Amino acid sequence: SLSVQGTTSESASVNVQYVPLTSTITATVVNQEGSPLAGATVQLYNTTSGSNT
Amino acid sequence: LVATQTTNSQGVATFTVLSFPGVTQTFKLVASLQGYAASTASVSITGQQNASV
């Protein structure tokens, strides 16, 4: 808000914004048949925490 | 068995076979060769595609 209180009580309502920061990691599986596998479980551990969180 | 090839020096073993739209046309490619290990891979073309492994 700019409540510019000079000579004028000017009331502005300037919106601003912020986008959060999220990361997205992808993993892929292929074999010797050259066909992408479905049903494979892949587990991401965050190993920058000093354990397998 | 509809086609057997003696492998060529251009390093594509190309064989022509009938195909049809909308069918998982599986093909087993067995390599039997004197001087190294005989091996069996397999592919599937679904409709028309180059299946190379």
Side-chain angles (χ1 to χ4, degrees):
Chain A
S1 192
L2 275 69
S3 296
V4 168
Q5 291 166 10
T7 31
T8 25
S9 177
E10 314 184 289
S11 51
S13 299
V14 180
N15 309 305
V16 310
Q17 282 297 332
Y18 190 76
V19 283
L21 270 73
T22 302
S23 60
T24 309
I25 297 84
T26 289
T28 186
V29 182
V30 68
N31 56 350
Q32 69 307 301
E33 293 197 54
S35 296
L37 276 299
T41 311
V42 56
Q43 318 171 249
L44 177 146
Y45 307 117
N46 182 12
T47 56
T48 336
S49 298
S51 53
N52 289 48
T53 304
Chain B
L1 180 51
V2 158
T4 296
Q5 303 282 107
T6 44
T7 45
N8 300 344
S9 324
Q10 52 250 41
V12 168
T14 154
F15 310 73
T16 165
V17 292
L18 299 189
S19 291
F20 320 104
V23 45
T24 178
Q25 297 193 254
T26 301
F27 300 93
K28 178 153 288 172
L29 289 157
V30 62
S32 46
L33 62 159
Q34 165 25 248
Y36 312 95
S39 182
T40 312
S42 288
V43 293
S44 301
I45 71 179
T46 315
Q48 308 312 289
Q49 46 173 115
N50 198 224
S52 39
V53 286

